[PDB]
Write a protein that binds this DNA or RNA. Structure first.
Ligand code: MG
Ligand code: MG
Lengths: 144, 144, 144, 144, 144, 144, 144
RNA sequence: AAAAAAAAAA
RNA sequence: AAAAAAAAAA
RNA sequence: AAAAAAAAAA
RNA sequence: AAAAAAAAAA
RNA sequence: AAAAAAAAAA
RNA sequence: AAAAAAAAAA
RNA sequence: AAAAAAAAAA
RNA sequence: AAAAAAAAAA
RNA sequence: AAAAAAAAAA
RNA sequence: AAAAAAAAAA
RNA sequence: AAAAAAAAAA
RNA sequence: AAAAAAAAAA
RNA sequence: AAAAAAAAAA
RNA sequence: AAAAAAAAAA
């Protein structure tokens, strides 16, 4: 390959976009209480911590969750996800449980193409339930 | 395809990165004076206007330039690029000229793999010369 | 095949969901008045009569309608469907007519993937018009 | 694919059923005492918690069990299942044991076609034995 | 081919629709001010001038824009499009620039299937920015 | 497929037409008297009820007719069509009869390419005769 | 297949045996002391608990052992098996050790065809040694 | 990958 | 997938 | 290995 | 016959 | 399955 | 798809 | 056309 | 020779 | 293995 | 050249 | 059409 | 894609 | 013989 | 020999 700078025979000015879209896998944690569902805010996806503070909308594709702290004594960890949507919330409770007391419980869900619209900060992604005080989420989405 | 939310049989917690790299084509303009070279600052690449204010380093791959305003009376536009490098500046003057007085002049250069290291805000990319008061640049780079 | 109970070499605890989705064909009737459009409520889809009272949302895929009572004297039955959507109602009037005075008139419409979002009890599916006092609907949908 | 609503050339009124059958995997827990067998009631399968309260009968296909709490000190978890049938109870004691003290014990059994008849709330599925105070069951069945 | 009228052996009365959908490419202009974004109203798509006054909803598929008047002295034309959506506005600024001062600048964007829902008169399609006082749009859509 | 908005590399301004042609199947009814021919006016094809009020001309391709009300006592329905043309009316009487007293009679005719010219509101399509007080027409035409 | 009882064209009285042989995998536990070998009695294989109380002889094919309780503090479990035979005891000490302190240690041995003779209650199968107070055995044998 | 239940298509 | 024991079929 | 987003090449 | 949802198997 | 009209792609 | 009547073409 | 029940044949 | 139950192997 | 009667499927 | 919408044919 | 970055699948 | 000049490799 | 830099051609 | 109109057949 070349070891020096070389000329580029540029043509006309191209189509440009200073603020493009971005497909990402965003990791963040949420605090969870015993027997109570926690509504995950879409606003958590927009942050300088993820280089996404310039976005105001996002299209969520999938959600994965893991328990982030140990479970109560004698128990195995569990985590549940209930998808939420502006056009109508679901009543599914996708659940994962650990089979070793020292291991994380995990589960996830995919959003179908027909339900992949935008969401803003004030919207919620899903409800999280667990016997662990913290849950780690990894959300696959398209910032736009 | 599916019309409803479906379960994802998630496994162990994956490797994650909240602040990934980003390959981009960044468009911006610079002011140019007659007979004077303008040093293009790398700092112009880091801005909320490009969603890149969270980065402090960038690896430039190629630089393309176009005249952005009309040339002086009776003249055809021209633009020249002189690559700059922290390990030693080049003396090449890659030039493009218009063949129609109403059209932009354009030129570019590719940086070879061996010279693709990082640059920070205080560094300069290249020197620009033109008979036009403004030059539009489109820089292909890897933010990291 | 086996005539006795046999062991299952079960492994780790699986992913579970006590409240899954359900693809259905829901039959119900609506009362219709001469020259007046009847707005079909989505709420009619949630009922113990269909085993769907545990759901609060549904994604409608297609709607089919049949006249359920005889038409006025000297006439042939007819039924019209006008799709309704939260993002904007349609002005289509899909119509079917009977070709035998003693036979039902029928028609239907398919909702495209891009318009297959959720609906809740307070929403309406479509407007029904007919010269018959009752119309029988069969709605293909995904409860979630 | 289509982006708009389209007509369906519906024919005669079809055969319908407002209350269909449903093949499911039902997860629930039972409390177990040391040295005592717990009779699992079929009634636990009918609940609004599973969207099955509209059913009064079910055909069980298979039963899987996991210990749901930690075992006594110095021990490895174990779980046993004894199939029960209205025409004659079995004396099999299908057992699983953990090989790591921190892991669940698991086992299951399949019901042969010849023994797949209906069961009602007052009937029992099987007897559960364990050294753990709770057992998690996942029953594969056909609600009708 | 036949030179006279011929009989058609018609059967039963067909399914009919007096008010069908219509796929179109709608051309219209908007006034634009220096440094200010113009919100393009969906209402502009419904007009007797396009034979679309009978529609109240439309599904936009793509938007293309061209500068419609000459740019300021010494400049090249430019046009920018920022997609707007009821579920969340985008922050993309798709841009085109002219490479000849006497030529139009142009750009466009495609709406993905998952975001192709209906819009009504009060909704907005996108924001337009330009250095030209007028922009000509051609919107590909499905009236319904 | 894409889940986000994407750029379109638009070129020059295309050829456009705000008021295009439209191929349609138009359904409407006419009142018919015993032993009297009813001249079907072309004007009935132009109406807001069909989204065609912006057109003033139409090219008819084919005409189909069905009896729309029951026939007199003891009789079977019948319908006759006599094509009319500005350059010379036909004397054909294309006829259909029912073979069941409760069923519609139907018939149609195709206009040959050589006779497919435009017609305006004041023109007539055909003459209708029937023993039924109403006839339902479905006219295949090209609005222009 | 048949849904009713059907005739069997039986012939002469067959050879019969009310008390047949049985190939089994028998699970049972033994108590073990630190630094002391435990002689496993063959008599443990004959019990109503295994449905084998009607047998007085058995041919052992293989022996597998697992530690059944946790090991002493700071240690990994271990289990050793020394085969015993009426014609001459072996001096082999087949051993397994755990590689995780929370996991069972396991080992086994196969008896060659030439040493597969019968054993009665008063005979011993093998000697067991372990640092765990209990060992779980699974013996593959032929009851006769 | 096949099969069973609900749905859709053919 | 083959083999051994019980059973069934051929 | 294919696909989607950004980029580059053709 | 294929596909989508629940389940089962591989 | 082909064709005509509107649209999109190539 | 073939044939018969009128017409046209070859 | 195959299968199940009764019968017949082989 | 195949299948079902228990076991073993792969 | 085919056929006849009843049934089921196609 | 394929596809989507309206129409026509098969 | 291939490749690089982010993502998804296998 | 080939060739000429400088360089590198073979 | 291929490749890299400058040039030329296609 | 094909096609168009009327008829008949398939
Ligand atoms: Mg009848
Ligand atoms: Mg471990």
């Amino acid at each position: 390959n070349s070891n020096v700078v070389t000329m580029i025979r540029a043509g006309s000015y191209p189509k440009v976009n200073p603020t493009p879209t971005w497909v990402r896998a965003i990791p963040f944690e949420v605090s969870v209480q015993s027997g109570i569902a926690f509504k995950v805010p879409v606003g958590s996806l927009f942050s300088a911590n993820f280089r996404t503070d310039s976005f105001t909308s996002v299209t969520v594709m999938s959600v994965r969750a893991w328990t982030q702290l140990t479970p109560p004594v004698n128990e195995y960890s569990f985590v549940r996800l209930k998808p939420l949507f502006k056009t109508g919330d679901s009543t599914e409770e996708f659940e994962g449980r650990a089979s070793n007391i020292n291991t994380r419980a995990s589960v996830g869900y995919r959003i179908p193409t027909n339900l992949r619209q935008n969401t803003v900060a004030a919207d919620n992604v899903c409800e999280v339930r667990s016997n662990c005080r913290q849950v780690a989420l990894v959300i696959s989405c398209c910032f736009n």
